[PDB]
Design a protein around this ligand. Structure first.
Ligand code: HEM
Length: 148
């Protein structure tokens, strides 16, 4: 594909400092949907403010986990059906922790925001479109974990 290379090339810049970049993604995420903050429950406690999450080693570990699943999608960009069962089960996990499937649309916007801000003029509309397709396929797979 042409899109496959556009994804690989755009990811390279970001994939080298995944915590820095996933930090932008999650900052944006809570700026858009602060009601996601309480779903990150470590040691029984609730983060009061978005900046509280950034001091949590467990939260930051989660950023790294997210960037690793995205990296798996990129690796597998030419065929994502091989991640389907992994992703379905990832979906069920998130259903279990209280995430509503609709919140994954905000996550997608947050990803696109992060890529836009890292790539600047290199985030062409074809790059956006390609990422939107890839993320969309990921969430389709995950959505099976919420009962189809
Ligand atoms: C609204 C967005 C999200 C919320 C509120 C959320 C919350 C959580 C929570 C509470 C856990 C369990 C605690 C932990 O391991 O940190 C978890 C695990 C995880 N999340 Fe997320 N998450 C979100 C989005 C994502 C996305 C977009 C990905 C990947 C693309 C992701 C990947 C993971 C992985 C890999 C784990 C470990 C799952 C396991 O135990 O096997 N999460 N998430």
């Amino acid at each position: 594909r042409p899109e496959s290379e556009l994804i690989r090339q755009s990811w390279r810049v970001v994939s080298r400092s995944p915590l820095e970049h996933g930090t932008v993604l999650f900052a944006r995420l809570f700026a858009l949907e602060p009601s996601l903050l309480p779903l990150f429950q470590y040691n029984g406690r609730q983060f009061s403010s978005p900046e509280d999450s950034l001091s949590s080693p467990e939260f930051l570990d989660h950023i790294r986990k997210v960037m690793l699943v995205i990296d798996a999608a990129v690796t597998n960009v030419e065929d994502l059906s091989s991640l389907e069962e992994y992703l379905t089960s990832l979906g069920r996990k998130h259903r279990a922790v209280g995430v509503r499937l609709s919140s994954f649309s905000t996550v997608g916007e947050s990803l696109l925001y992060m890529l836009e801000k890292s790539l600047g003029p290199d985030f062409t509309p074809a790059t956006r479109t390609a990422w939107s397709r890839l993320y969309g396929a990921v969430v389709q797979a995950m959505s099976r974990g919420w009962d189809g």
